Design a protein around this nucleic acid. Structure first.
Ligand code: NI
Length: 288
DNA sequence: GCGCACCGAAAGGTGCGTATTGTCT
């Protein structure tokens, strides 16, 4: 699954909290992109530099970016592309404990982002005429997480693409995100294909469903739903309001997701894993 | 965006809208 969300000023607090969330059996933060190579960024994401970049401060001595933003409009700080694995894949990786599956997810994400980068663009005006240039470079902060809001195993990565890109003439500008945003479904299929390929190299058999999504063949739907509490909460909201999931409006969909949410409280990380294992036995899951 | 108005200073730049599957911010 792949979803996008344009980030604005009001989201600056959430964007930097991508450090606190998830889970810790684990390089869970990493830089990516030619634009990042350009600025001298590699390895772990330094939280201090990340905040400055979100604010439009490339550092080194040039001016704060994006001053051309209209005061009656919102300032954009980035674009979050969130990659999520199928439930069974999260289970095998975080409950049974297969570290090679974590790597399979990371590779799939990295390869998809390379194709999103090929779609990076910027604008440039010369004597009144505006032109769109395919830029090819991005600055990305990647944060891997391990739990859902209800604390079920949920392997995912928040790829935060910063609102900046370097043109042919050497000038840094805001990202024209059209091609990346409109290619979300296509990029989601790239992630699915690469993940599948990496899992098959490890020896797993896959079961394709109907949307073109897949789950490991040895884990069934009943067992999957037993580790999908949020999905259960969303389904109850629709039922209570008497709505048909096949035809709900966007407003109703967002309402079901947002309003059925409970508050995020912390957990004892070592104890949670043991709970998962006992729950898995209860559901009759054989990880063999 | 389906070329605009309004940002700051460059006969220059930006938001805006874009999206829509499930494991579910
Ligand atoms: Ni997360």
């Amino acid at each position: 699954m792949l979803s996008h969300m344009v980030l604005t000023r009001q989201d600056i607090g959430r964007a930097a909290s991508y450090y606190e969330d998830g889970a810790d059996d684990y390089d869970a933060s990493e830089w990516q992109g030619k634009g990042a190579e350009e600025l001298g960024l590699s390895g772990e994401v330094d939280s201090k530099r990340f905040r400055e970049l979100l604010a439009g401060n490339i550092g080194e001595g040039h001016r704060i970016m994006r001053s051309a933003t209209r005061q009656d409009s919102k300032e954009r700080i980035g674009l979050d592309l969130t990659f999520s694995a199928p439930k069974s894949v999260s289970l095998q990786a975080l409950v049974a404990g297969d570290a090679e599956i974590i790597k399979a997810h990371d590779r799939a994400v990295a390869r998809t982002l390379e194709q999103a980068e090929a779609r990076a663009q910027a604008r440039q005006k010369i004597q009144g005429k505006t032109r769109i240039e395919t830029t090819g470079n991005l600055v990305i902060g990647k944060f891997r997480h391990e739990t859902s809001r209800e604390r079920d195993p949920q392997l995912h990565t928040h790829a935060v693409i910063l609102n900046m890109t370097k043109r042919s003439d050497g000038q840094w500008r805001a990202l024209k995100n059209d091609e990346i945003v409109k290619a979300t479904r296509y990029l989601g299929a790239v992630y699915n294909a690469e993940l599948a390929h990496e899992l098959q190299k490890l020896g797993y058999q896959l079961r394709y469903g109907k949307d073109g999504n897949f789950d490991l063949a040895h884990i069934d739907r009943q067992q999957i739903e037993g580790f999908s509490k949020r999905t259960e909460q969303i389904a109850e909201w629709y039922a209570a309001r008497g709505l048909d999931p096949n035809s709900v409006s966007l407003e109703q969909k967002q309402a079901a997701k947002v309003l059925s949410r409970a508050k995020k409280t912390s957990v004892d990380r070592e104890a949670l894993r043991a709970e998962w294992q006992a729950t898995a036995k209860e559901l009759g899951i054989d990880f063999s």
